[PDB]
Each structure stands twice: as structure tokens, then as C-alpha cells.
């Protein structure tokens, strides 16, 4: 039982759980047809905005560590993510949607503090609730 | 000038900040 240094500095480096607060965290695999998405091997000199390895290593037992509340997007645990630039700019910089560029990227599970589901359709399709919040300055009660 | 107080006082987070929070208060009030 080495528990090889492949798990040791790649078991999170306890990072992104405490880095770019370790929640909102969500969907979408360790890899499928390698042509398209991208800033794959291009996030300026690192892959600080992607991940490297190991579904069995960390996710099975890593632990509860470092949070924000519950859950649930679409589904549950098999393969996940890493970034600081979540739901709004999570999708003007990566992972467009439905199906995608390449052939239709697939699946994962989330947990932030905004109460609800899917994480694909309404939250993650270049939704400019930044440029449609100068719409609220007179809405819902005013004369 | 004031595209910079109204594009940067709401990008204390590029993501859900007050950003996703008057989508949830346009939601709460009719």
C-alpha cells in the first residue's frame, strides 16, 4: 500500500476546496473525444482552470471537506470540476452546451447556495443577468 | 467613469454575487 504520490499531491493539494471558494462545484467528466472544447492545455501556463486525475482516489473517500450547502443540479457523483469564475462566466469562458461543440458532453453534480436544479439550461447558456440587471431599476412596484 | 462603478461594484464576483441575487429578487417580488 504505497498510496502512490500520484494520489498525494493530486489528492486536491487540498485546493479548490479552499481555492476559489470550494463550493458551487458541479458537473462534467475526466474526458471524452479530445478535439474541441478548449483552453485545454491553454489556461495561460498551468491547467489551473481544469483538473488532472483520479475519480476513485479522492471522490470516493476524500471527505466532506470545506463546503457550501446541499446539492443536486441534474444527478450525483462520478466526475467533477475546478475554477473561480462560476455560473455567469463559467459559461462565457468554457463548456457552451446542448449538445456542445464536440459530440455532446454529458454529466455530473453540483452544490452552491441558490436552491435548485439542472445547472445546464437556465444558469449556463451565456446568461447575461449582468447586462439584464439594469432592467430591475424600476421594475415590480413603481408608478 | 460610471460604467466602472456599475460594472465593477457588481464584480466583487464575476459569478453569482448581487448578479444572481436580483434574478432571485425579481423572482421573489412578482
Amino acid at each position: 500500500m504505497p498510496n502512490k504520490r500520484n494520489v498525494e499531491l493530486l489528492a486536491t493539494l487540498k485546493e479548490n476546496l479552499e481555492r476559489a471558494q470550494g463550493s458551487f462545484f458541479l458537473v462534467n467528466y475526466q474526458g471524452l473525444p479530445a478535439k474541441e472544447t478548449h483552453a485545454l492545455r491553454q489556461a495561460l501556463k498551468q491547467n489551473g482552470a481544469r483538473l488532472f486525475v483520479a475519480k476513485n482516489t479522492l471522490i470516493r473517500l476524500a471527505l466532506k471537506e470545506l463546503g457550501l450547502p446541499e446539492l443536486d443540479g441534474l444527478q450525483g457523483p462520478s466526475a467533477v470540476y475546478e475554477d473561480p469564475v462560476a455560473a455567469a462566466k463559467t459559461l462565457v469562458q468554457f463548456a457552451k452546451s446542448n449538445p456542445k461543440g464536440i459530440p455532446q458532453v454529458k454529466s455530473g453534480l453540483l452544490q452552491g447556495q441558490i436552491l435548485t436544479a439542472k445547472d445546464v439550461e437556465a444558469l449556463a447558456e451565456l446568461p447575461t443577468m449582468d447586462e439584464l440587471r439594469a432592467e430591475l431599476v424600476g421594475v415590480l412596484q413603481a408608478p | 467613469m460610471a460604467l466602472d462603478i456599475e460594472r465593477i461594484k457588481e464584480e466583487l464576483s464575476q459569478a453569482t454575487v448581487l448578479e444572481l441575487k436580483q434574478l432571485i429578487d425579481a423572482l421573489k417580488e412578482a
Binding site: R41, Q42, L44, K45 | -
Partner: protein, 142 residues
């Protein structure tokens, strides 16, 4: 996929292997022995890559993003007309002055941009050619 070249220094040569073999390749070759001929014109021979693409039909694609790995080598760097028995003799020795930022041209695409990257990439057929040249006198850890 669809890849080959056109070269060497200037006065492009569509020879029996370098451009008359454009049949079931792209075939609009009267005006596009001239729209590449300013994209390898007035640069100088050391390698000068050629990027060529695929289509549904017949013409009009891109050229190149960088000529590295022996080019910014044998202009003035490393004095590397790196003679036969490729050289454990110092056929020519340098530092990272005509290697590191002679080409920040490298930065378009080798997937790592910050310069211990495609700098030391192109010090592959330059630096480790027998005389592994030097980047410093070895930083002095402390």
C-alpha cells in the same frame, strides 16, 4: 490529416513533390501560388513551417503561426551550423538571449505560453544537441 509544405527561403519552388501534387489536395493553383508567396516571403531560410487545412471544397485556408525548432537557432543563435556527429564539441554555444525572446513568436500555439515554455521547447533541437547549452549558471538555490 491534410499536411505538407512549400519552401525554402524565398522564390518558392513548386517542384515534383512540393505543389504540382495539388490534385485531390486543394486545386485552385494559379492565384494561390501567390497568396502564400507573401507568407513565406522576405523571412530567410532555416525551416519556415507550412500549416495547411481541409475543406468541403477547393480553396482558401490559413498559413502558419510560428517557424521554430531550428529557425531562431541558425540565424545568429548557438552558431548552430551544427556540424556532423551533431556535436559534443560546442559547434556553437550561447545563452537564452537568441532563444528565449527572439521568438515570443512561439506564443501562438505550443500550449504553454509563459517563457520557460516554448522557449525551452525550441532549445530542444538547439540546446540539448550535444552541448546542453545553458539557461543560466544554475540559479543558486539558497
Amino acid at each position: 490529416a491534410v499536411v505538407k509544405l512549400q519552401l525554402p527561403a524565398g522564390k518558392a519552388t513548386p517542384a515534383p513533390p512540393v505543389g504540382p501534387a495539388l490534385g485531390q489536395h486543394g486545386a485552385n493553383i494559379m492565384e494561390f501560388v501567390k497568396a502564400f508567396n507573401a507568407a513565406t516571403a522576405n523571412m530567410g531560410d532555416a525551416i519556415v513551417p507550412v500549416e495547411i487545412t481541409i475543406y468541403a471544397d477547393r480553396s482558401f485556408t490559413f498559413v502558419t503561426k510560428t517557424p521554430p525548432a531550428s529557425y531562431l537557432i541558425r540565424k545568429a543563435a548557438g552558431l548552430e551550423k551544427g556540424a556532423h556527429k551533431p556535436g559534443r564539441e560546442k559547434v556553437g554555444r550561447i545563452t537564452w538571449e537568441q532563444v528565449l525572446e527572439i521568438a515570443k513568436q512561439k506564443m501562438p500555439d505550443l500550449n504553454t505560453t509563459d517563457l520557460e515554455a516554448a522557449a525551452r521547447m525550441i532549445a530542444g533541437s538547439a540546446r540539448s544537441m550535444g552541448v546542453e547549452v545553458v539557461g543560466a549558471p544554475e540559479v543558486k538555490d539558497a
